[PDB]
């Protein structure tokens, strides 16, 4: 089987600048003078589409900005300027052999500038603790990078234990991430703290956000 | 212009079967060889199995040989893939892609051009569950509430704010699977304003365990 | 980032009034000068309003002299629009857009550099009506169904294909206004083994009626 | 005031071709040498984008494949090379005096390839005859250009009487239009005829699209 390997792995590109994806072959992939790799697109819920074809074929309907390259082994996707819509996972592929083998994609991403987090906190609901559960929930929301670390202290304590962080892609108009953090604990250790704290470090800023409830 | 829509997904369990088509349009169907592709968040995209225009020719990725079939129905435009056997392994997206040849001069070139939507397939005994819907109620001219929708199996789940009325500030985050049970979490910003002198409410639906709830989030008190 | 929301729009009678928020963000409010700017068909985008960071100036439109009254509250981050002697001419999509300054080397130049989404506001005398949904039921490999909404006012409805599920190859058509009622439909293809084998219904909301109905498609016979 | 006066009106453009649309006002909008044209971008339930100010200055995060020029009275956009993401509707504005002025806008669309319609006809429900109303829908889908000539016959008759035609904007990924012509009767006037027929003229093709049902 040959292998395709992408790098790097993610990027972050400002919007005017030129992105470049790297996709190495372990075996080669031109057979005579034509390299069969191939370049796919793939923006989130969306199913894949047709970059470039042969290595530097422009796929239908694909702006002169994307452009492909590389022979034998080596392979890369360029992108010239970068625009606010190109946000996506990028796939190498040969059709060279079977079986028909891809690359594990490269996710390119608008670098915008640094966005701070807009954090908010819920304890749980009435009808939650009715039924015995508390979850306590915290959004993180519109930041920029996603590099974030959410913490949790009860009462003071470092929880590392019963939390849930989720993230969202890159918005699609905004380029900024958000995430939500999900404490579970049961109704009857929620009721043994008093105070829930949700914290964020982010790198626009030396203090976290500290956003807390006392039940 | 070219098109195909995949269908039959589903939730199987671990040693079942399951059939999934995939309908085109567009293009002389009985002239193209068709490709199923799959995808999983470990897995990236992976090549499934391929049939050409009369099906003379067939080839099935390793993982796949021995368990599903690849089939068409030229007349129908169908593309079909016959799952059996089925192991976690196995769950992911389904594409069915067509496999297109650019009249090179160099001789044509074939390059799976067109793809679709794609199937969820999930194969699990884990049990169908039906989740739980909860307000999230505040504790600035901008005020964030959300709903918080656990315990339930299988993906995935929709949600909407006031109808998809309130669409804009609206972040719905992926769920997360914390011991056969998912969980997920919405929030929708709305000038203080509007809150509460203007109900706000989230409209959950569950296809799966056929469960369709709207929870309104009222102030906490 | 630079956030604007507007609120308040709405169903008025001809000689009445409203009042529009805009709740701002993201930027030092009390710093800039804001605008309220309309559309409607028979407009395009048509200037209404404009008032300094103080106040000390503001500016209205021909047509909204002596009725409308811009304002703000630095504090509350909101600026406002109260409309009285409304009249239909005014039925129109209302954005408070922000004033922002473009530091030049000629000096600073100013330019509606951010707007919100808007607001509805329609004056009409029309009465208050819901809709009613009728099932579209076919007389390929692709079959196209459908929903028709008609006699309700005002605008808007929602309309939804299995709860959001069926989301692509989805028609949702301009209303028209025949005679004070609005009339939509809306159109979905899916693959013509899923119907009727699998359930394919519009879910129809029409809030100013407080009217929410889900119709299934169902063969005619 | 000053009147912006757009060029042309509609505009339907290939993608990688150069999109140049035209502005001009009644009075001269620059101030000494800096002219105050602005240019704004609006794309169907979106609010306008700032574009081009000052006639020829990008604004923010806006390619370089936008430019705006002209001085005094006339002024341009152009747009090269055409994109998937550019249709919208453009305007320009005047900020020397008070009021401030907009143009009426001009819709620049996507020249893709022609593309028949698909129709589709349905009678009325059992439930909308139950109430004795019978509204005939017809659904003209995915074509282009949008011009399109869409006619009812009853019995073979046409029928300009009672029919309500809607257009979709140009769609997003497709670049096409779509359409519903609906056909209003009472219950008993619908049960008065047998054929029912719906028709569609359009470039693809000479002979119309006849789709029609026998009540």
């Known amino acids: 089987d040959t292998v395709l390997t992408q790098s790097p792995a993610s990027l972050a590109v400002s919007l005017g600048q030129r992105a470049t994806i790297s996709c190495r072959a372990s075996e080669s992939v031109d057979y005579y003078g034509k390299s069969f790799m191939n370049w796919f697109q793939q923006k989130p819920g969306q199913p894949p589409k047709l970059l470039i074809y042969?290595?530097?074929n422009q796929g239908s309907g694909v702006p002169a900005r994307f452009s492909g390259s590389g022979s034998g082994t080596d392979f890369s996707l360029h992108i010239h300027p970068m625009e606010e819509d190109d946000s996506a996972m990028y796939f190498c592929?040969?059709?060279?052999?079977?079986?028909?083998?891809f690359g594990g994609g490269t996710k390119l991403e608008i670098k915008r500038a640094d966005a701070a987090p807009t954090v908010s906190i819920f304890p749980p609901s009435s009808e939650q603790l009715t039924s015995g559960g508390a979850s306590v929930v915290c959004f993180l929301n519109n930041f920029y990078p996603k590099d974030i670390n959410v913490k949790w202290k009860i009462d003071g304590s470092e929880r590392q234990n019963g939390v849930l962080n989720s993230w969202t892609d890159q918005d699609s108009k905004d380029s900024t991430y958000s995430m939500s953090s999900t404490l579970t604990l049961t109704k009857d250790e929620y009721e043994r703290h008093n105070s829930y704290t949700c914290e964020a470090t982010h790198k626009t800023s030396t203090s976290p956000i500290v956003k807390s409830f006392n039940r | 212009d070219v098109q195909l829509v995949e269908s039959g997904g589903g939730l199987v369990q671990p040693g079942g079967s399951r059939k999934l088509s995939c309908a085109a349009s567009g293009f002389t169907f009985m002239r193209f060889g068709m490709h199923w592709v799959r995808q999983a968040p470990e897995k990236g995209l992976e090549w499934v199995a391929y049939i050409s225009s009369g099906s003379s020719t067939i080839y099935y990725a390793d993982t796949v040989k021995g368990r599903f079939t690849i089939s068409r129905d030229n007349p129908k435009n169908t593309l079909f893939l016959q799952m059996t056997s089925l192991r976690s392994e196995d769950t992911a997206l389904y594409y069915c892609?067509?496999?297109?040849?650019?009249?090179?001069?160099?001789?044509?070139?074939?390059?799976?051009?067109?793809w679709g939507q794609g199937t969820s397939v999930t194969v699990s005994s884990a049990k169908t569950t039906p989740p739980s819907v909860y307000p999230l109620a505040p504790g600035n001219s901008m005020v964030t509430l959300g709903c918080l929708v656990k315990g339930y199996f299988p993906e995935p789940v929709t949600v909407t704010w006031n109808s998809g009325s309130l669409s804009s500030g609206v972040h719905t985050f992926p769920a997360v699977l914390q011991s056969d049970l998912y969980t997920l979490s919405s929030s929708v910003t709305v000038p203080s304003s509007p809150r509460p002198s203007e109900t706000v409410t989230c409209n959950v639906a569950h296809p799966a365990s056929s469960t369709k709830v709207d929870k309104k989030i009222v102030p906490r008190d | 980032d630079v956030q604007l929301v507007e609120s308040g729009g709405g169903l008025v009678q001809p000689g009445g009034s409203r009042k529009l928020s805009c709740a701002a963000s993201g930027f030092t409010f009390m710093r800039f000068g804001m605008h309220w700017v309309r559309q409607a068909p028979e407009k395009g985008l048509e200037w209404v309003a404009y008032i300094s960071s103080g106040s000390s100036t503001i500016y209205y439109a021909d047509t909204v002299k002596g009725r409308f009254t811009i304002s703000r509250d630095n504090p509350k981050n909101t600026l406002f629009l109260q409309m009285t002697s409304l009249r239909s001419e005014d039925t129109a999509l209302?954005?408070?857009?922000?004033?922002?300054?473009?530091?030049?080397?000629?000096?600073?130049?100013?330019?509606?550099?951010?707007?919100?989404?808007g607001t509805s506001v329609t004056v009409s005398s029309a009465k208050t009506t819901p809709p009613s949904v009728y099932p579209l039921a076919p007389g390929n490999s692709m079959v196209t169904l459908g929903c028709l909404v008609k006699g309700y006012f005002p605008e808007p409805v929602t309309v939804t294909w299995n709860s959001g599920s069926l989301s692509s190859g989805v028609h949702t058509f301009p209303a028209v206004l025949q005679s004070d009622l609005y009339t939509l439909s809306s159109s979905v293809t899916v693959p013509s083994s899923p119907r009727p084998s699998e359930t394919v219904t519009c879910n129809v909301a029409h809030p100013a009626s407080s009217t929410k109905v889900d119709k299934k498609i169902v063969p005619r016979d | 005031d000053t009147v912006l006066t757009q060029s042309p009106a509609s505009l339907a453009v290939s993608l990688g071709q150069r999109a140049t649309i035209s502005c001009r006002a009644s009075e001269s909008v620059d101030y000494y040498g800096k002219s105050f044209m602005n240019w704004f971008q609006q794309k169907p339930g979106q609010p306008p984008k700032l574009?081009?100010?000052?006639?020829?200055?990008?604004?923010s995060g806006v390619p370089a494949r936008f430019s705006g020029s002209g001085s005094g009275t006339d002024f341009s956009l152009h747009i090269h090379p055409m994109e998937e993401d550019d249709s919208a509707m453009?305007?320009?504005?005047?900020?020397?005096?008070?009021?401030?002025?907009?143009?009426?806008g001009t819709k620049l669309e996507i020249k893709r390839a022609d593309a028949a319609p698909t129709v589709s006809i349905f009678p009325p429900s059992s439930e909308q005859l139950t109430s004795g109303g019978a509204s005939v829908v017809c659904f003209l889908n995915n074509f282009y250009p949008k011009d399109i000539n869409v006619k009812w016959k009853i019995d073979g008759s046409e029928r300009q009487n009672g029919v309500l035609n809607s257009w979709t904007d140009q769609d997003s990924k497709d670049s096409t239009y779509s359409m519903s012509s609906t056909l209003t009767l009472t219950k008993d006037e619908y049960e008065r005829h047998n054929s029912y027929t719906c028709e569609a003229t359009h470039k693809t093709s000479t002979s119309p699209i006849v789709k029609s049902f026998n009540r």
């Open positions: 592929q040969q059709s060279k052999e079977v079986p028909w083998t």
């Open positions: 042969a290595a530097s």
């Open positions: 892609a067509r496999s297109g040849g650019i009249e090179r001069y160099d001789g044509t070139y074939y390059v799976m051009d067109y």
